[PDB]
Write an enzyme that holds these catalytic residues in place. Sequence first.
Site, PDB file in Angstrom:
ATOM      1  N   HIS A  15       2.964  11.287   6.551  1.00 25.56           N
ATOM      2  CA  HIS A  15       2.098  10.898   7.751  1.00 25.56           C
ATOM      3  C   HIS A  15       3.233  10.336   8.718  1.00 25.56           C
ATOM      4  O   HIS A  15       3.568   9.146   8.726  1.00 25.56           O
ATOM      5  CB  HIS A  15       1.050   9.975   7.391  1.00 25.56           C
ATOM      6  CG  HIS A  15       0.079  10.572   6.606  1.00 25.56           C
ATOM      7  ND1 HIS A  15      -1.141   9.631   6.016  1.00 25.56           N
ATOM      8  CD2 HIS A  15      -0.233  11.579   6.350  1.00 25.56           C
ATOM      9  CE1 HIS A  15      -1.637  10.608   5.269  1.00 25.56           C
ATOM     10  NE2 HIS A  15      -1.468  11.657   5.643  1.00 25.56           N
TER      11      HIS A  15
ATOM     12  N   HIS B 157       5.092   7.087   6.734  1.00 24.25           N
ATOM     13  CA  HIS B 157       4.811   6.745   5.426  1.00 24.25           C
ATOM     14  C   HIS B 157       4.476   7.690   4.620  1.00 24.25           C
ATOM     15  O   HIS B 157       4.194   9.012   5.154  1.00 24.25           O
ATOM     16  CB  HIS B 157       3.846   5.539   5.414  1.00 24.25           C
ATOM     17  CG  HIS B 157       2.536   6.037   5.875  1.00 24.25           C
ATOM     18  ND1 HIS B 157       2.173   5.955   7.130  1.00 24.25           N
ATOM     19  CD2 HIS B 157       1.702   6.556   5.328  1.00 24.25           C
ATOM     20  CE1 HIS B 157       0.716   6.363   7.347  1.00 24.25           C
ATOM     21  NE2 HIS B 157       0.504   6.867   5.810  1.00 24.25           N
TER      22      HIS B 157
ATOM     23  N   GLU C 234      -3.397  13.480   0.129  1.00 24.36           N
ATOM     24  CA  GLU C 234      -4.729  13.098   0.731  1.00 24.36           C
ATOM     25  C   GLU C 234      -5.433  14.373   1.062  1.00 24.36           C
ATOM     26  O   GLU C 234      -6.442  14.917   0.605  1.00 24.36           O
ATOM     27  CB  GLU C 234      -4.549  12.173   1.804  1.00 24.36           C
ATOM     28  CG  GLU C 234      -3.759  10.695   1.439  1.00 24.36           C
ATOM     29  CD  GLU C 234      -4.217   9.669   1.958  1.00 24.36           C
ATOM     30  OE1 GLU C 234      -4.094   9.609   3.293  1.00 24.36           O
ATOM     31  OE2 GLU C 234      -4.740   8.830   1.484  1.00 24.36           O
TER      32      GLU C 234
ATOM     33  N   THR D  20      -6.940   6.832   7.028  1.00 25.86           N
ATOM     34  CA  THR D  20      -7.132   7.053   5.546  1.00 25.86           C
ATOM     35  C   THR D  20      -7.113   5.887   4.654  1.00 25.86           C
ATOM     36  O   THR D  20      -7.252   5.653   3.605  1.00 25.86           O
ATOM     37  CB  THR D  20      -6.799   8.208   4.828  1.00 25.86           C
ATOM     38  OG1 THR D  20      -4.865   7.569   4.661  1.00 25.86           O
ATOM     39  CG2 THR D  20      -6.441   9.457   5.619  1.00 25.86           C
ATOM     40  N   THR D  21      -6.918   4.532   5.240  1.00 28.55           N
ATOM     41  CA  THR D  21      -6.574   3.206   4.749  1.00 28.55           C
ATOM     42  C   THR D  21      -7.714   2.369   5.689  1.00 28.55           C
ATOM     43  O   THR D  21      -7.932   2.600   6.682  1.00 28.55           O
ATOM     44  CB  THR D  21      -5.447   2.414   4.652  1.00 28.55           C
ATOM     45  OG1 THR D  21      -4.965   2.509   5.952  1.00 28.55           O
ATOM     46  CG2 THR D  21      -4.395   3.487   3.677  1.00 28.55           C
TER      47      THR D  21
ATOM     48  N   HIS E  38       0.835  -1.358  -0.022  1.00 31.31           N
ATOM     49  CA  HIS E  38       0.084   0.032  -0.079  1.00 31.31           C
ATOM     50  C   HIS E  38       0.875   1.102   0.087  1.00 31.31           C
ATOM     51  O   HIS E  38       0.580   2.229  -0.548  1.00 31.31           O
ATOM     52  CB  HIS E  38      -0.887  -0.040   1.065  1.00 31.31           C
ATOM     53  CG  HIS E  38      -1.756  -1.145   0.968  1.00 31.31           C
ATOM     54  ND1 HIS E  38      -1.980  -1.942   2.297  1.00 31.31           N
ATOM     55  CD2 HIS E  38      -2.817  -1.729   0.369  1.00 31.31           C
ATOM     56  CE1 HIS E  38      -2.665  -2.982   1.906  1.00 31.31           C
ATOM     57  NE2 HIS E  38      -3.161  -2.680   0.933  1.00 31.31           N
TER      58      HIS E  38
ATOM     59  N   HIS F  46       2.064   9.197   0.966  1.00 25.89           N
ATOM     60  CA  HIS F  46       1.052   9.135  -0.102  1.00 25.89           C
ATOM     61  C   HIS F  46       1.423   9.954  -1.120  1.00 25.89           C
ATOM     62  O   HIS F  46       1.869  11.035  -0.942  1.00 25.89           O
ATOM     63  CB  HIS F  46      -0.287   9.331   0.521  1.00 25.89           C
ATOM     64  CG  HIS F  46      -0.756   8.767   1.674  1.00 25.89           C
ATOM     65  ND1 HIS F  46      -1.633   7.601   1.446  1.00 25.89           N
ATOM     66  CD2 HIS F  46      -0.534   9.009   2.775  1.00 25.89           C
ATOM     67  CE1 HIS F  46      -1.990   7.134   2.829  1.00 25.89           C
ATOM     68  NE2 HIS F  46      -1.328   7.921   3.753  1.00 25.89           N
TER      69      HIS F  46
HETATM   70 NI    NI Z   1      -1.374   7.781   5.813  1.00 22.92          NI
END
Ligand code: NI
EC number: 4.2.1.1
Length: 257
Positions: free
Chosen positions: A116, A91, A103, A195-196, A61, A93
Site C-alpha cells: 500500500h 507499508h 487484503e 483497512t485498519t 501492526h 500486509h
Molecule cells: Ni494498508
Amino acid sequence: HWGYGKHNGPEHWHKDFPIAKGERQSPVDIDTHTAKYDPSLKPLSVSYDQATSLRILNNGHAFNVEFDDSQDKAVLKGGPLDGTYRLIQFHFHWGSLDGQGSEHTVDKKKYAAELHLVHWNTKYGDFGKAVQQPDGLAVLGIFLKVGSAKPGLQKVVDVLDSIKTKGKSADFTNFDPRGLLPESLDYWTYPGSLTTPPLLECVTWIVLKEPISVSSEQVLKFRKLNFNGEGEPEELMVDNWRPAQPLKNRQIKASFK
Ligand code: NI
Ligand code: NI
C-alpha cells in the site's frame, strides 16, 4: 484493543469502530467478470523522481516507510483522481503462508502480500484533515506473489532486523519506491476505506492488475518481524490483513479492456 490475534482481530473491530460495518469498507474482492472498463479514466501519473524517504517504523501492526510530504516531491495524479495526492508512507500486509496475505482478492484469489502506497489530497493541507474527507486519500495497492526476488525491495528487507519490535524505527533515506512497481500501471478503482482502525471511508483505491514477484527469502524475512515490543513475548508479525468486505452499493471500474 485491535490487532490480528486470536481475540482482537478483524471480526471484533466493529465494537470500537462501528463503521467497520459501513457502506464503503475495504478491502473487497475484485471480480474481473463484473468490473467494467471505464473510458472516462486516465492513465495513472506516478511522479516519484523527487521522493524523499526518511525513516522506517515498526508500529506494531506493520512497518511504515515514511516520506517527506511537506512539498510535492512524490505525487500521484490522474487515473480516477482530481488534484494532487502526496505520498506519506508505504507499508505491506502479508501472510504466514504463501497462499494468503493480501487484503484485496481477485476472483477470490489471495496473494502472498499486498503493498500500500498511501497518498493524501493536498487540497486538505495535512493527512489528519484528509482522512476526514471522502476524497482525502489515494492508496495504490500492488499484489505480491512469491517467485523471483524483487531487487528494489531488498534494502527494505535488510533493515528489518533493526526494527524487529513495535516502536523501533531506523533511518531510511534515499529509498526509491519506483523499484516496487510492476511494468504495467493498468488498474482497478473503487471508493473505500482505511483497512485498519479507524476504518475511515476516505480512500480512492487504485489496485494494480499486475503483481510484483518477491522471493521466498524476502517473504520469510518479513515473517520474522514482531507485533510485540522488545522484552515482551514474541508474537510473529504475520497475517496482518483484513479479509474482503461486502461491496454493497459500489462498482469497481477498470482502466483496461
Ligand atoms: Ni494498508
Ligand atoms: Ni489496543
